Amino acid sequence: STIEEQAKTFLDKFNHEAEDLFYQSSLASWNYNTNITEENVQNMNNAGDKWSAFLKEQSTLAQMYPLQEIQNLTVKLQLQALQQNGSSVLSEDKSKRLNTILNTMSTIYSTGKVCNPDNPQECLLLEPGLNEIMANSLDYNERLWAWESWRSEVGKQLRPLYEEYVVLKNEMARANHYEDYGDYWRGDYEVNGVDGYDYSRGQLIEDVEHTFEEIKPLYEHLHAYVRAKLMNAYPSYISPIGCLPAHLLGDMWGRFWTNLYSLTVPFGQKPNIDVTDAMVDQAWDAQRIFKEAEKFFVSVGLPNMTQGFWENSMLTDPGNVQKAVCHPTAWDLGKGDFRILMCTKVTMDDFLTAHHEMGHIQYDMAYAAQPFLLRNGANEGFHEAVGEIMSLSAATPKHLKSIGLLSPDFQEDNETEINFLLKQALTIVGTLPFTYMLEKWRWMVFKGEIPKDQWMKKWWEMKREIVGVVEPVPHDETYCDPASLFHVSNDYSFIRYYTRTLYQFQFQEALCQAAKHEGPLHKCDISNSTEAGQKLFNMLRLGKSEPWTLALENVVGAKNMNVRPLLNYFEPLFTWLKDQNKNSFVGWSTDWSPYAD
């Protein structure tokens, strides 16, 4: 016998037990997340320990099958996924130290409180805390204090822990035949074996820079437009040719500029689209919202949901006798079990998030026939893109008018379109430079080009160079402000958001061209169309057995990411911003600082 038959038998024997063990672990996790008790915690820990022990014992046994003797692509990919050692290459003491550091950082981030200076007994939390302050406030000193206290209290106790974390991660990456942690993170965008579809871990940075070089002018115009109104908001504070303070971007870190819509509205006399009052008047509920979402998903040619979905999902708040987490998540347990946990309220945001969750569920149900090791998306930014392309179609005025939420006497003008485009831009475009700068800084830190005595210096330099935000108070090398974010302290990536932002617009343009739409792109709707549904299902069924380049070519006809759809989408807003800024200055200088006077 050859190696292929032995590998196939091993894979079958592995999957047969892996399915059952993963189902048990997922059921335990669901029982924990639904009801918070101590027995549920014990059961979840036991299930997790059993699953980890199974994954450990199943490793070191697939090493008998070298990859140089396998000619089938599926078996080779499965074996390559199984042969990953991980953190077991290090010693036991270093592994225990790393786990202790991770748990310590998680506990420090999850347990934080800011006390009042004049009253040490008045200590506020973070989420029922500084978020409400940074969200709704029109005071310079209050925002400055809420920023400085938060970045000085929990920004000084994480420097040596993060240094040791970086050292240990670099050692682990070098032990795992990688150059650094950046290569370990970029290894997801790697395809080797198929002629004409290969991808390397160095072309991604080049593509990202090439796309940002074209995205930059729109961000420059948006910043020039926002600064003009910020000057009128806070007099004698904003400079007409200077940068912007970090404590005025809308939130704690300035990731989203959504809260600045109230002050930067183009036309305040025109009404907005809020169907919340209509939903309250018509007395809807979660059942109606989910049934409308199901009707929308069936109108394009997708299968119906299962009875277990309607029988086992939690779509309402249980109350006060039972505690649970209201974070909307999609659960895939296996064996034909799909559930959704969401505390649904009678609003429009929940109506839009329901479509995102249902798109996630449809994607999960798409590749149910693939093997266990391939039951995943072809890339990171695919599930979120599939959800967003559905949310955008559900958030159209035509759909709301057809479902009966908007009166048929609505007069669509140009000012409403401008307001909608600006509201979408303040959310979409405002997060790209921040993510790019953060990821580039993390990559340069992991690579070793930035010495330890220049971390904050290079951080603020890159800030003022790319994002154009200057700090109000200079900080020395004793702070750890970049680690004040959730994803930075919990060991997560950030390029997935950029990839999703590109892929969503690419897929939207592809589907709107396939649906024979005429007119602007922001008015497209894919309702009642089987061609687009089939073209999307052809890609959703592949899963992880095919490279993402071929999956993208089967949809848009391209192998790499592109930025032209976003420009075609925001062209009218670009023209309006040009017309408004014709009598204004564009650009910003890095020489100005709030502490210069």
Partner: protein
């Protein structure tokens, strides 16, 4: 009027596995096909070779009945000319089969919490089976090139469990399948239909 004992086959408390199925012999009685709607009115019949309308006025010699439990995604493999893991290693039908296949859902009977590991099936074998063949061997399967001694690398157990649960999907639920074969030999036919 003597009726055939269909309650001993359709109203059993415990069924067998797919690798070790039972075969009963029915003779010298009247075949009443109307009591089957009492066990379950929803009986998915599938006749290959004969029609149910012309099946009432025929007389046969011996009627064989087979019973086993499989999943919902494996019901399609119980047919002449199918390929898979059940049709190749557990139970195969000939290409000239003349009978009917009946199946129904038994989720509320053969399903418990914490798993029901009382059903097994064969997955690993050297060759394929022949029509109407049974194998109950429990020897360790050899996949490598070394002599098998015990259990370990490249030496696996040929039996695997199902573990049904009531929360599984409609495809991963237990189903009870009954096969009916009709045989005509050079002997007086003692199995006819009601008049």
């Amino acid at each position: 009027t003597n009726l055939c004992p269909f309650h001993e086959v359709f109203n059993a408390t415990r069924f067998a596995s797919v690798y070790a199925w039972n075969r009963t012999r029915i003779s010298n009685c009247v075949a009443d096909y109307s009591v089957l709607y009492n066990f379950a009115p929803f009986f998915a019949f599938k006749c290959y070779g004969v029609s149910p309308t012309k099946l009432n006025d025929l007389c046969f010699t011996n009627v064989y009945a087979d019973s086993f439990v499989i999943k919902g995604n494996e019901v399609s493999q119980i047919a002449p000319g199918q390929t898979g893991n059940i049709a190749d290693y557990n139970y195969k039908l000939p290409d000239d089969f003349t009978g009917c296949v009946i199946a129904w859902n038994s989720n509320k009977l053969d399903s418990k919490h914490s798993g029901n590991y009382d059903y097994w099936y064969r997955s690993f074998r050297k060759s394929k089976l022949k029509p109407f063949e049974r194998d109950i061997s429990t020897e360790i399967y050899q996949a490598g090139n070394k002599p098998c001694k015990g259990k370990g690398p490249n030496c696996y157990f040929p039996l695997q469990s199902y573990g049904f649960r009531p929360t599984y999907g409609v495809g991963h639920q237990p189903y009870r399948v009954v096969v009916l074969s009709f045989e005509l030999l050079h002997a007086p036919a003692t199995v006819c239909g009601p008049k």
